[PDB]
Amino acid sequence: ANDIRDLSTTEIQDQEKALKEELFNLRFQLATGQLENTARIREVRKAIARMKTIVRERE
RNA sequence: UUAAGUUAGAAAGGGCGCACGGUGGAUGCCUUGGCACUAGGAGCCGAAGAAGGACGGGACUAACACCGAUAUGCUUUGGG
Ligand SMILES: [Mg+2]
């Protein structure tokens, strides 16, 4: 959270993209039954949320 | 032995009493919920989109509760 606030808006935007891609691949693996660490999903969801929050605080 | 006479016992099933079960949810005990008030506060919400909803959100989710594509939560300030 404090680490996110360090980054620029554009850099956060790119951090989101990565997390969105990560979340997508987790959901993919999960559906194909190839995901063990299913707790990863919630973390990534929360992370995305956190990043959007900081960006909206910037404005 | 014949004759005459008298009387017993019997239960297919049934009755009464008793014993033991079943069913059923009365009664007692209990209380998560109600009822009536008192004192104090407050008596409004809505185009800055209401009341009330629908559909969604969990690793798996039928329902309830919570939340809204930032979805079973996000940030922050305090408590602990
Ligand atoms: Mg704290």
Say which nucleotide is closest to residue A40, CA to C1' distance.
Answer: B59
Q: What is the torsion angle, in degrees rounded to the nearest 10, for the CA atoms of residue A31, residue A12, residue A2 and residue A48?
A: -20
Give the count of domains, chain A.
1
Look up the domain containing A49 and give its range.
1-59
Chain B: bases < 7 Å from a protein Cβ: 58-60, 70-76
Beta carbon of A31 within 7 Å of strand B?
Answer: no
Distance CA A20, CA A32 (A): 19
> What b/e sequence results for A19-36 when a residue is b if at least 16 CB atoms lie within 10 Å of its CB, and e otherwise?
beebbeebeebeeeeeee
Which residue in this structure is represented by tokens 């605080």?
A: A57
For residue A34 the two structure tokens come to: 């190839």
**Residue A1's CB: how many other CB atoms inside 10 A?**
9
Q: What is the Cα A38 distance to its own chain's centre?
A: 15
CA-to-C1' distance for A15 and B57, Å? 23
What is the experimental method? cryo-EM
